[PDB]
């Protein structure tokens, strides 16, 4: 046929499939929505797993920031609702391999509102 990948494989995989999470629009432009985790189940690695943008905007990759070094997810730029009212992107993971086995992760962001917190 084509290909049948069958053994074991140290891959990173993300904790979550879809990382599902509420950030208010009134997020300032470094204001931390949440972090990548890359469970290798080894106890501890030898520190060799990245977080990049996979799947990304040209609005998404300057309206947030991500650290690469430390995996941790934030905002880059103020964020009106109106412009967006819920953001998707996804976020790749290498390990080893040339290119490397990279490992997609898609992040839901729901848009929620500050002003609107009920009395």
Same mark, same amino acid.
């Given at each position: 046929?084509?290909? $049948?990948?069958?053994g074991?494989?140290?891959?990173?995989?993300?904790?979550?499939? #879809?990382?599902? @999470?509420?950030?208010?629009?009134?997020? @300032?432009?470094?204001?931390?929505?949440?972090?990548?985790?890359?469970?290798?189940? +080894? !106890?501890? #690695?030898? $520190?060799?797993? %990245?977080?990049?943008? $996979? @799947?990304?905007? %040209?609005?998404? =990759? =300057? &309206?947030?920031? &991500? +650290?690469?070094?430390? $995996?941790?997810?934030?905002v880059?730029?103020?964020?009106? =609702?109106?412009?967006?009212?819920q953001?998707?992107?996804? !976020?790749?993971?290498?390990?080893?391999?040339?290119?490397?086995?990279?490992?997609? @992760?898609?992040?839901? &962001?729901?848009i929620?509102? %500050?002003?609107?917190? !009920?009395?």
């Open positions: 046929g084509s290909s $049948g990948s069958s074991n494989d140290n891959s990173p995989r993300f904790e979550k499939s #879809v990382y599902e @999470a509420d950030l208010a629009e009134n997020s @300032a432009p470094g204001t931390p929505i949440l972090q990548l985790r890359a469970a290798d189940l +080894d !106890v501890g #690695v030898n $520190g060799q797993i %990245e977080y990049v943008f $996979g @799947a990304a905007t %040209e609005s998404v =990759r =300057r &309206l947030l920031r &991500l +650290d690469e070094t430390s $995996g941790w997810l934030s880059l730029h103020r964020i009106d =609702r109106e412009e967006v009212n953001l998707r992107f996804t !976020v790749m993971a290498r390990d080893r391999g040339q290119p490397p086995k990279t490992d997609k @992760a898609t992040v839901v &962001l729901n929620k509102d %500050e002003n609107d917190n !009920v009395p």
